């Protein structure tokens, strides 16, 4: 059983924590001060330390530092509130793996726990700038809730989870919090993103294919998602050939690998994303309406940002950091005037908009504080 090192000195909040995790079926060990966390690591390693920058006896940095003088491997995740950010980018550049905005959600948590342990010891590669709260996961509007009830609900149905969304919505981040809350979290997650591939590959990535199939014996997504989640993303971009071999996997299980005749068959729990209006794109005869139906079951619709009041508030906060960090700068904080701005503009390009300014801002200036001043048009 996996072991995480919850440091934390909030009895309620480590609490609440700890209960998130409970899909996960890990043994987490609660702390609440920098001398028993450093006291627990002497005997036991854990798969992964959650440490709070606050703490009764010492700071977290004080921590980490100490955890990093003899244990170089052991990921840590910093527990950060928003007025702590320019700590929590200080603690990713001494040698922690990743921070959380607090408060923290359940599906965000287990989505950071899972990827943290699946990275140490197959599912789809990830690095920092993939978290959920980068992607727009975080915050608790009335249209967020909606979207973590479902999830709640569906994750532990195979039934196919249907999600739509604008780009930029947090889809994606959406499929892992379902992996990470079913009964398969600890199986494989597999994304495919159908428009990333070519045409002419995109079979092989998804079926695989054997020795000389075109100008190896390769595993493709649906073998290395056996007993876990196929994510397929930008789904409506996939050809009518390649949907009519998809409705046929999906209905038997069964598949042929590029270049052979054998049949193969996996056992896959199912999530898509479309950013089009898949019924839409049925009528225009650009969708099998058969997979339509095959797989418009457990629908999701993310909301857009502008949709989800002070979520924004959360997800600029999380990217502040993660573009000071990318660009080697140092902020930390918005002024009141900047956030609200934020919150009245409708950000057309949801969180790649959003990105994309703060990145903006942080190479074009040098302050720990985003001004008016520096807000680009058509911001302001």
Not at 310 to 333: P, Q, T, V, W, Y
């Amino acid at each position: 059983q996996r072991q995480v090192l919850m440091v934390e000195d909030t009895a309620s909040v480590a609490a609440l924590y700890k209960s998130y995790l409970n899909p996960l079926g890990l043994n987490v060990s609660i702390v609440g001060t920098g001398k028993e966390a450093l006291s627990f690591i002497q005997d036991i390693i854990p798969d992964l330390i959650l440490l709070d920058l606050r703490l009764p006896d010492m700071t977290g940095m004080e921590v980490l530092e100490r955890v990093r003088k003899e244990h170089g491997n052991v990921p840590v995740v910093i527990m950060t509130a928003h007025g702590s950010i320019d700590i929590a980018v200080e603690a990713i550049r001494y040698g922690a793996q990743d921070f959380l905005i607090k408060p923290c959600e359940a599906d965000r948590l287990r989505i950071t726990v899972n990827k943290a342990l699946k990275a140490e010891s197959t599912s789809t590669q990830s690095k920092q700038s993939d978290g959920a709260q980068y992607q727009g996961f975080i915050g608790n509007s009335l249209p967020m809730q909606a979207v973590y009830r479902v999830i709640e609900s569906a994750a532990s149905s195979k039934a196919t989870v249907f999600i739509t969304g604008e780009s930029g919505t947090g889809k994606e981040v959406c499929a892992e919090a379902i992996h990470a809350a079913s009964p398969r979290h600890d199986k494989p997650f597999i994304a495919l993103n159908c428009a990333a591939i070519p045409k002419d590959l995109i079979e092989s990535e998804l079926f695989g294919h054997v020795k000389g199939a075109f100008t190896t014996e390769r595993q493709g997504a649906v073998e290395m998602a056996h007993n876990g989640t196929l994510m397929l993303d930008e789904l409506c971009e996939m050809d009518l050939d390649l949907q009519s071999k998809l409705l046929r996997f999906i209905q038997t299980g069964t598949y042929q690998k590029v270049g052979s005749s054998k049949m193969s068959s996996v056992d896959v729990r199912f999530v898509c994303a479309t950013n089009r209006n898949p019924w839409e794109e049925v009528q225009e005869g650009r969708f099998r309406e058969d997979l339509y139906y095959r797989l418009h079951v457990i629908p999701i619709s993310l909301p857009p940002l502008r949709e989800r009041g002070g979520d924004i508030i959360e997800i600029a906060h999380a990217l502040l950091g993660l573009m000071s960090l990318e660009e080697g700068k140092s902020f930390s904080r918005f002024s009141e005037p900047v956030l609200r701005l934020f919150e009245s503009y409708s950000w057309p390009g949801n969180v790649r908009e959003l990105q994309n300014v703060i990145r903006n801002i942080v190479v074009l200036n040098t302050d720990d504080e985003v001004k008016l001043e520096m807000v680009p048009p058509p911001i302001l």
